[PDB]
Design an enzyme around this catalytic site. Structure first.
Site, PDB file in Angstrom:
ATOM      1  N   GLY A  76     -37.774 -14.046 -42.293  1.00 29.28           N
ATOM      2  CA  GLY A  76     -38.835 -13.727 -43.296  1.00 29.28           C
ATOM      3  C   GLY A  76     -39.883 -12.454 -42.822  1.00 29.28           C
TER       4      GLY A  76
ATOM      5  N   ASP B 264     -35.391 -11.416 -45.616  1.00 28.21           N
ATOM      6  CA  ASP B 264     -36.167 -11.822 -46.725  1.00 28.21           C
ATOM      7  C   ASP B 264     -37.200 -10.851 -46.829  1.00 28.21           C
TER       8      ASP B 264
ATOM      9  N   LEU C 198     -29.179 -18.572 -42.173  1.00 31.77           N
ATOM     10  CA  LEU C 198     -30.357 -18.213 -41.387  1.00 31.77           C
ATOM     11  C   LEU C 198     -30.916 -16.904 -41.786  1.00 31.77           C
ATOM     12  N   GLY C 199     -32.099 -16.734 -42.127  1.00 29.69           N
ATOM     13  CA  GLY C 199     -32.668 -15.283 -42.364  1.00 29.69           C
ATOM     14  C   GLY C 199     -34.054 -14.978 -41.761  1.00 29.69           C
TER      15      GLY C 199
ATOM     16  N   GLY D 292     -19.300 -15.872 -55.814  1.00 33.00           N
ATOM     17  CA  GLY D 292     -18.479 -15.549 -55.020  1.00 33.00           C
ATOM     18  C   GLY D 292     -18.802 -15.103 -53.449  1.00 33.00           C
ATOM     19  N   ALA D 293     -20.135 -14.732 -53.228  1.00 30.33           N
ATOM     20  CA  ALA D 293     -20.559 -14.263 -51.866  1.00 30.33           C
ATOM     21  C   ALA D 293     -20.925 -15.411 -50.936  1.00 30.33           C
ATOM     22  N   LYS D 294     -20.982 -15.074 -49.748  1.00 31.77           N
ATOM     23  CA  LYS D 294     -21.541 -16.013 -48.637  1.00 31.77           C
ATOM     24  C   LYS D 294     -22.860 -15.735 -48.389  1.00 31.77           C
ATOM     25  N   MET D 295     -23.756 -16.461 -48.303  1.00 32.60           N
ATOM     26  CA  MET D 295     -24.977 -16.242 -47.815  1.00 32.60           C
ATOM     27  C   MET D 295     -25.571 -16.782 -46.499  1.00 32.60           C
ATOM     28  N   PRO D 296     -26.012 -15.972 -45.318  1.00 33.25           N
ATOM     29  CA  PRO D 296     -26.318 -16.815 -44.151  1.00 33.25           C
ATOM     30  C   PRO D 296     -27.221 -17.628 -44.052  1.00 33.25           C
TER      31      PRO D 296
ATOM     32  N   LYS E   6     -37.481  -9.503 -54.011  1.00 27.45           N
ATOM     33  CA  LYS E   6     -38.087 -10.117 -55.151  1.00 27.45           C
ATOM     34  C   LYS E   6     -38.908  -9.112 -56.172  1.00 27.45           C
TER      35      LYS E   6
ATOM     36  N   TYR F  58     -44.799  -7.551 -50.340  1.00 32.26           N
ATOM     37  CA  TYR F  58     -45.427  -7.871 -48.744  1.00 32.26           C
ATOM     38  C   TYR F  58     -45.852  -6.407 -48.302  1.00 32.26           C
TER      39      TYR F  58
ATOM     40  N   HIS G  93     -39.747 -13.326 -58.221  1.00 29.91           N
ATOM     41  CA  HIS G  93     -40.625 -13.964 -57.285  1.00 29.91           C
ATOM     42  C   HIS G  93     -41.665 -15.213 -57.731  1.00 29.91           C
TER      43      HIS G  93
HETATM   44  N1  LIG Z   1     -40.767 -17.083 -52.361  1.00 27.99           N
HETATM   45  C1  LIG Z   1     -42.159 -16.835 -51.940  1.00 27.99           C
HETATM   46  O1  LIG Z   1     -43.053 -17.264 -52.734  1.00 27.99           O
HETATM   47  C2  LIG Z   1     -42.407 -17.174 -50.356  1.00 27.99           C
HETATM   48  C3  LIG Z   1     -41.306 -16.799 -49.801  1.00 27.99           C
HETATM   49  N2  LIG Z   1     -41.540 -16.838 -48.495  1.00 27.99           N
HETATM   50  C4  LIG Z   1     -40.626 -16.230 -47.270  1.00 27.99           C
HETATM   51  O2  LIG Z   1     -40.417 -17.188 -46.295  1.00 27.99           O
HETATM   52  C5  LIG Z   1     -40.526 -16.507 -45.082  1.00 27.99           C
HETATM   53  C6  LIG Z   1     -41.102 -17.551 -43.879  1.00 27.99           C
HETATM   54  O3  LIG Z   1     -42.256 -18.326 -44.260  1.00 27.99           O
HETATM   55  P1  LIG Z   1     -43.834 -17.928 -43.798  1.00 27.99           P
HETATM   56  O4  LIG Z   1     -44.796 -18.337 -44.908  1.00 27.99           O
HETATM   57  O5  LIG Z   1     -43.778 -16.463 -43.366  1.00 27.99           O
HETATM   58  O6  LIG Z   1     -44.162 -19.096 -42.383  1.00 27.99           O
HETATM   59  P2  LIG Z   1     -43.292 -19.495 -41.642  1.00 27.99           P
HETATM   60  O7  LIG Z   1     -43.111 -21.006 -42.045  1.00 27.99           O
HETATM   61  O8  LIG Z   1     -41.857 -18.884 -41.258  1.00 27.99           O
HETATM   62  O9  LIG Z   1     -44.075 -19.555 -40.077  1.00 27.99           O
HETATM   63  C7  LIG Z   1     -44.526 -18.179 -39.782  1.00 27.99           C
HETATM   64  C8  LIG Z   1     -45.599 -18.458 -38.542  1.00 27.99           C
HETATM   65  O10 LIG Z   1     -44.810 -19.140 -37.752  1.00 27.99           O
HETATM   66  C9  LIG Z   1     -45.034 -18.430 -36.399  1.00 27.99           C
HETATM   67  N3  LIG Z   1     -43.684 -18.691 -35.617  1.00 27.99           N
HETATM   68  C10 LIG Z   1     -42.373 -18.350 -36.156  1.00 27.99           C
HETATM   69  N4  LIG Z   1     -41.658 -18.687 -35.085  1.00 27.99           N
HETATM   70  C11 LIG Z   1     -42.265 -19.597 -33.849  1.00 27.99           C
HETATM   71  C12 LIG Z   1     -41.890 -20.411 -33.029  1.00 27.99           C
HETATM   72  N5  LIG Z   1     -40.682 -20.131 -32.605  1.00 27.99           N
HETATM   73  N6  LIG Z   1     -42.819 -21.010 -32.205  1.00 27.99           N
HETATM   74  C13 LIG Z   1     -44.042 -20.961 -32.528  1.00 27.99           C
HETATM   75  N7  LIG Z   1     -44.450 -20.169 -33.673  1.00 27.99           N
HETATM   76  C14 LIG Z   1     -43.686 -19.516 -34.522  1.00 27.99           C
HETATM   77  C15 LIG Z   1     -45.070 -16.709 -36.590  1.00 27.99           C
HETATM   78  O11 LIG Z   1     -45.798 -16.405 -35.727  1.00 27.99           O
HETATM   79  P3  LIG Z   1     -45.431 -14.723 -35.241  1.00 27.99           P
HETATM   80  O12 LIG Z   1     -44.929 -13.967 -36.254  1.00 27.99           O
HETATM   81  O13 LIG Z   1     -46.832 -14.370 -34.739  1.00 27.99           O
HETATM   82  O14 LIG Z   1     -44.433 -14.700 -34.104  1.00 27.99           O
HETATM   83  C16 LIG Z   1     -46.093 -17.039 -37.831  1.00 27.99           C
HETATM   84  O15 LIG Z   1     -47.219 -17.067 -37.591  1.00 27.99           O
HETATM   85  C17 LIG Z   1     -41.780 -15.719 -45.386  1.00 27.99           C
HETATM   86  O16 LIG Z   1     -42.113 -14.612 -44.558  1.00 27.99           O
HETATM   87  C18 LIG Z   1     -41.315 -15.045 -46.760  1.00 27.99           C
HETATM   88  O17 LIG Z   1     -40.110 -14.203 -46.210  1.00 27.99           O
HETATM   89  C19 LIG Z   1     -42.790 -17.127 -47.882  1.00 27.99           C
HETATM   90  C20 LIG Z   1     -43.748 -17.755 -48.666  1.00 27.99           C
HETATM   91  C21 LIG Z   1     -43.630 -17.589 -50.134  1.00 27.99           C
HETATM   92  N1  LIG Z   2     -49.552 -11.356 -51.241  1.00 29.76           N
HETATM   93  C1  LIG Z   2     -50.784 -11.483 -52.198  1.00 29.76           C
HETATM   94  C2  LIG Z   2     -51.774 -12.648 -51.694  1.00 29.76           C
HETATM   95  C3  LIG Z   2     -53.066 -13.058 -52.374  1.00 29.76           C
HETATM   96  C4  LIG Z   2     -52.538 -14.177 -53.202  1.00 29.76           C
HETATM   97  O1  LIG Z   2     -53.095 -14.378 -54.408  1.00 29.76           O
HETATM   98  N2  LIG Z   2     -51.554 -14.913 -52.860  1.00 29.76           N
HETATM   99  C5  LIG Z   2     -50.838 -16.089 -53.507  1.00 29.76           C
HETATM  100  C6  LIG Z   2     -49.515 -16.243 -53.342  1.00 29.76           C
HETATM  101  S1  LIG Z   2     -49.001 -16.733 -51.910  1.00 29.76           S
HETATM  102  C7  LIG Z   2     -47.351 -15.600 -51.383  1.00 29.76           C
HETATM  103  C8  LIG Z   2     -45.967 -16.243 -51.852  1.00 29.76           C
HETATM  104  C9  LIG Z   2     -44.853 -15.318 -51.205  1.00 29.76           C
HETATM  105  O2  LIG Z   2     -44.952 -14.830 -50.178  1.00 29.76           O
HETATM  106  O3  LIG Z   2     -43.968 -15.116 -52.111  1.00 29.76           O
HETATM  107  C10 LIG Z   2     -47.758 -14.225 -52.087  1.00 29.76           C
HETATM  108  O4  LIG Z   2     -46.967 -13.842 -53.047  1.00 29.76           O
HETATM  109  O5  LIG Z   2     -48.539 -13.274 -51.856  1.00 29.76           O
HETATM  110  C11 LIG Z   2     -51.502 -17.440 -53.079  1.00 29.76           C
HETATM  111  O6  LIG Z   2     -51.549 -17.707 -51.893  1.00 29.76           O
HETATM  112  N3  LIG Z   2     -52.237 -18.150 -53.853  1.00 29.76           N
HETATM  113  C12 LIG Z   2     -52.778 -19.427 -53.348  1.00 29.76           C
HETATM  114  C13 LIG Z   2     -54.571 -19.136 -53.491  1.00 29.76           C
HETATM  115  O7  LIG Z   2     -55.326 -19.058 -54.614  1.00 29.76           O
HETATM  116  O8  LIG Z   2     -55.082 -18.944 -52.348  1.00 29.76           O
HETATM  117  C14 LIG Z   2     -51.388 -10.322 -52.284  1.00 29.76           C
HETATM  118  O9  LIG Z   2     -51.960  -9.825 -51.457  1.00 29.76           O
HETATM  119  O10 LIG Z   2     -51.019  -9.511 -53.403  1.00 29.76           O
END
Ligand SMILES: NC(=O)C1=CN([C@@H]2O[C@H](COP(=O)(O)OP(=O)(O)OC[C@H]3O[C@@H](n4cnc5c(N)ncnc54)[C@H](OP(=O)(O)O)[C@@H]3O)[C@@H](O)[C@H]2O)C=CC1
Ligand SMILES: N[C@@H](CCC(=O)N[C@@H](CS[C@@H](CC(=O)O)C(=O)O)C(=O)NCC(=O)O)C(=O)O
EC number: 1.1.1.21
Length: 315
Positions: free
Chosen positions: A18, A43, A15-16, A9-13, A77, A48, A110
């Site tokens: 990370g 997110d 664009l978030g 029932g809720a709305k999620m943006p 997560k 992290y 996660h």
């Molecule tokens: N559920 C899961 O297991 C995972 C969840 N996530 C979520 O997804 C989020 C986003 O993915 P993520 O892996 O961080 O990588 P992204 O694909 O979001 O890319 C991040 C990289 O892109 C750079 N960047 C951002 N905007 C621009 C731009 N406009 N021009 C050029 N470069 C840019 C950033 O640089 P800088 O910061 O220096 O500006 C950073 O180095 C994560 O932070 C996390 O919240 C990610 C991985 C796993």
């Molecule tokens: N965040 C972890 C990073 C080390 C790790 O094992 N990361 C995993 C998960 S990636 C990431 C995914 C996410 O952002 O949720 C995370 O949870 O750290 C990975 O990249 N495995 C592939 C490999 O063998 O190199 C940590 O330092 O605890």
């Protein structure tokens, strides 16, 4: 559309912001700039190690009355070492304390993989392999549903679950709350067409992570594919007079996904939010979809033997 409706029932943006890899000394500012420029979805994850600092930003914007709590959509997560039923609430509460919130709008498992509880985020054995925990995702889901009933989170979801694993939950006897979201890696090189169609058919919203290909991923090998430098994508960006990052963020938006680009760079944060004033043609969409390579940024290679490793199945 600025937000998507969730099965609760809720709305999620759509664009978030990370925060994975957003350093503790720069993410408070990144989140503050993000809210100032319009982001209403952040997110986060206990893993992290920067929730306290993300929390500072949120509390300051609330205190300054830049935005109200009901207007924000905060996501965290449950990390793998807290899958045991008796550990879920505590993990949720730690994240709520660090973020300084009274509730989370969405709390996700996660990874489908539970590891041995303890101080180490990735406990390994005398060979490296991660030491699993004998908890199963279904029991873990029940503990997640209790958080909703206790007022701690408004919706619960999953992350990195393959379709059979999503099916496991949907089929849980006694299932009380269905997962509202499955956050998975999604970009032109890992398009996820089958897993997305599967989830949407089930009323589960998909959030695309690493939409830009996580160019700051620690394990980046400078020979690897690079979205931001793909000429085919830049040509598309060029045509619409947008940046390639703007194209990569608009791409999942048009497939009815939520997208969470990460940046700690003020100008990039602002740039990334300017994705509601242009539209990719269905021809551009299909061309972007054609670049799929099944290339994963997050493969969790250290857990390829875990019973619930999610990436051996085709989706
Ligand atoms: N559920 C899961 O297991 C995972 C969840 N996530 C979520 O997804 C989020 C986003 O993915 P993520 O892996 O961080 O990588 P992204 O694909 O979001 O890319 C991040 C990289 O892109 C750079 N960047 C951002 N905007 C621009 C731009 N406009 N021009 C050029 N470069 C840019 C950033 O640089 P800088 O910061 O220096 O500006 C950073 O180095 C994560 O932070 C996390 O919240 C990610 C991985 C796993
Ligand atoms: N965040 C972890 C990073 C080390 C790790 O094992 N990361 C995993 C998960 S990636 C990431 C995914 C996410 O952002 O949720 C995370 O949870 O750290 C990975 O990249 N495995 C592939 C490999 O063998 O190199 C940590 O330092 O605890």
């Amino acid at each position: 559309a600025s937000r998507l409706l969730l099965n609760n029932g809720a709305k999620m943006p759509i664009l978030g912001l990370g925060t994975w890899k957003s350093p503790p000394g720069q993410v408070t500012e990144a989140v503050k700039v993000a809210i100032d420029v319009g982001y209403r979805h952040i997110d986060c994850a206990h893993v992290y190690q920067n929730e306290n600092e993300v929390g500072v930003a949120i509390q300051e914007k609330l205190r300054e009355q830049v935005v109200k709590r009901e207007e924000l959509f905060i996501v965290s997560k449950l990390w793998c070492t807290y899958h045991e039923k008796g550990l879920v609430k505590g993990a949720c509460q730690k994240t709520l304390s660090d973020l300084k919130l009274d509730y989370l709008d969405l709390y996700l498992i996660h990874w489908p993989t539970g590891f041995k509880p303890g101080k180490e985020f990735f406990p390994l054995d005398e060979s490296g392999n991660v030491v699993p925990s004998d908890t199963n995702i279904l029991d873990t889901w029940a503990a997640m549903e209790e958080l909703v009933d206790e007022g701690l989170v408004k919706a619960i979801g999953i992350s990195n679950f393959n379709h059979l694993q999503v099916e496991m939950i949907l089929n849980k006897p006694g299932l009380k709350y269905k997962p509202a979201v499955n956050q998975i890696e999604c970009h032109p090189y890992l398009t996820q067409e089958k897993l997305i169609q599967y989830c949407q058919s089930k009323g589960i919203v998909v959030t695309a992570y690493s939409p830009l290909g996580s160019p700051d991923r620690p394990w980046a090998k400078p020979e690897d594919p690079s979205l931001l430098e793909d000429p085919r994508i830049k040509a598309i960006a060029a045509k619409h007079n947008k940046t390639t990052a703007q194209v990569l963020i608009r791409f999942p938006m048009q497939r009815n996904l939520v997208v969470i680009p990460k940046s700690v760079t003020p100008e990039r944060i602002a740039e990334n939010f300017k994705v509601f004033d242009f539209e990719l043609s269905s021809q551009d969409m299909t061309t972007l979809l054609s670049y799929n390579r099944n290339w994963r940024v997050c493969a969790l290679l250290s857990c390829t033997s875990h019973k619930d490793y999610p990436f051996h199945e085709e989706f």
